[PDB]
Amino acid sequence: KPHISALNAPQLDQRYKNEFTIGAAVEPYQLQNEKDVQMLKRHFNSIVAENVMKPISIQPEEGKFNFEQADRIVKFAKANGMDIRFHTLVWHSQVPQWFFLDKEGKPMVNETDPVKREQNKQLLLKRLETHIKTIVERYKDDIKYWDVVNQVVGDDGKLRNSPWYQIAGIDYIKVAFQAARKYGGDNIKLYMNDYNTEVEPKRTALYNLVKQLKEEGVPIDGIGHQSHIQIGWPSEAEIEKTINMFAALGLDNQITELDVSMYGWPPRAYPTYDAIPKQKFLDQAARYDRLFKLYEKLSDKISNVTFWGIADNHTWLDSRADVYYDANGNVVVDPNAPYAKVEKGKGKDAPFVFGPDYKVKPAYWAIIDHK
């Protein structure tokens, strides 16, 4: 099956249109890149901001709101009949730090006096409410799906002990969802989003958290499974079990940040795309074949599958593609093997079904057929 230009291959959204939308994460510069635009128009019917809707992009100083970059995604989406997802209202990752400073500019995590800690809690929660309010009041008629909180459960199975949690405890999660529902109304759909949702003890900690929150009337419509996965891990059986277990709570599932890395963890990458052997693309294609067959089997529990980029020329996985060199300067990709130094984030991953030249990969054929 040939390595033809994606730009006029059979449309990926159309293949799956009764099963789930097919989305892509974008940067605004891609909306001014001819090829990226034609890719979005041709293959996708859902869109998400990779970065420009994060808290630090939207409100980098209190009261200073930058909607200009988000607005461009929204406009493009509306003009092309795409669903939009909002990524994300609340996250621990370089939030703007002003959220977590007390009335004197001191970090709130340092306060020892209980009455002052409680005032800080209330103050952070008010700030959270205003951030959400302002965003949802602006986009509630345009944006259907919302990542309300991101990565709030730790890999150890405990609530992630971020400044949100240290200052406000569990109420930050409750307040985030209540606020989104209050200002956005009943027709926006609210998600909790996380990675390694398939993995214990995180998976059961997430299930227990969401079950409790719903029992308490906190409005949560679904779970976003970031799905930053590998060729051989996690298994399809474990993916299946995860999806089924949340759907049994009455939750929607979205696959929100799908990519299939060529590597393991910590990754030992090839230094360029050219160096990735052909067989890796075939192993990737068989993985995508199995994965999309599974998503199709569960299509009544999954409303969306979104890739965390467009084509292999741009992927955040490159920032993790560390290149290992032996003493003679040869590249090392075997996870156990000797090496002398590492160049962090300098290699090249290849995670999508579309190549860096915008031609289809063997993974594309694996998911566009009906076998």
Ligand X SMILES: O[C@@H]1[C@@H](O)[C@H](O[C@@H]2CO[C@@H](O[C@@H]3CO[C@@H](O[C@@H]4CO[C@@H](O[C@@H]5CO[C@@H](O)[C@H](O)[C@H]5O)[C@H](O)[C@H]4O)[C@H](O)[C@H]3O)[C@H](O)[C@H]2O)OC[C@H]1O
CB of 228 to ligand X, least distance (A): 4
Near ligand X by CB under 6 A, which window of 120-128, 157-165, 226-234, 351-359? 226-234
69 binds ligand X, rule: CB under 6 A:
no
CB of 52 to ligand X, least distance (A): 10
Q: What residues form DSSP beta bridges with 359? A: 5
Cα 43 from chain centre: 19
For residues 12 and 152, which CB has a smaller minimum distance to ligand X in the complex? 152
String marking each residue 78-117 x if it binds ligand X according to CB under 6 A: ---------x------------------------------
Closest among 6, 7, 19, 27 to 76, alpha carbons compared: 27
Near ligand X by CB under 6 A, which window of 171-179, 225-233, 235-243, 271-279? 225-233
CB distance 47 to 83 below 8 Å: yes
274 binds Zn ion, rule: CB under 5 A:
yes
Q: What residues form DSSP beta bridges with 360? A: 354
CB of 226 to Cl ion, least distance (A): 14
What is the distance between the alpha carbons of residues 15 and 262, in angstroms, rounded to a whole number?
25
What is the distance between the alpha carbons of residues 220 and 191, in angstroms, rounded to a whole number?
6
- Select from ligand X, Zn ion, Cl ion, none the partner in contact with residue 20, using the beta carbon and a kind-dependent cut-off of 5 to 8 Å: Zn ion
CB of 170 to Cl ion, least distance (A): 31
- Select from Zn ion, ligand X, Cl ion, none the partner in contact with residue 233, using the beta carbon and a kind-dependent cut-off of 5 to 8 Å: ligand X
164 binds ligand X, rule: CB under 6 A:
no
One of 15, 144, 346, 359 touching Zn ion (CB under 5 A): 359
One of 51, 119, 130, 299 touching ligand X (CB under 6 A): 51
Number of residues counted as binding ligand X (CB under 6 A): 12
312 binds Zn ion, rule: CB under 5 A:
no
The residues that touch ligand X, with contacts defined as CB under 6 A, are: 50-51, 87, 150, 195-196, 226, 228, 233, 257, 265, 316
The residues that touch Zn ion, with contacts defined as CB under 5 A, are: 13, 20, 45, 50, 272-274, 289, 299, 355, 357, 359, 366, 369
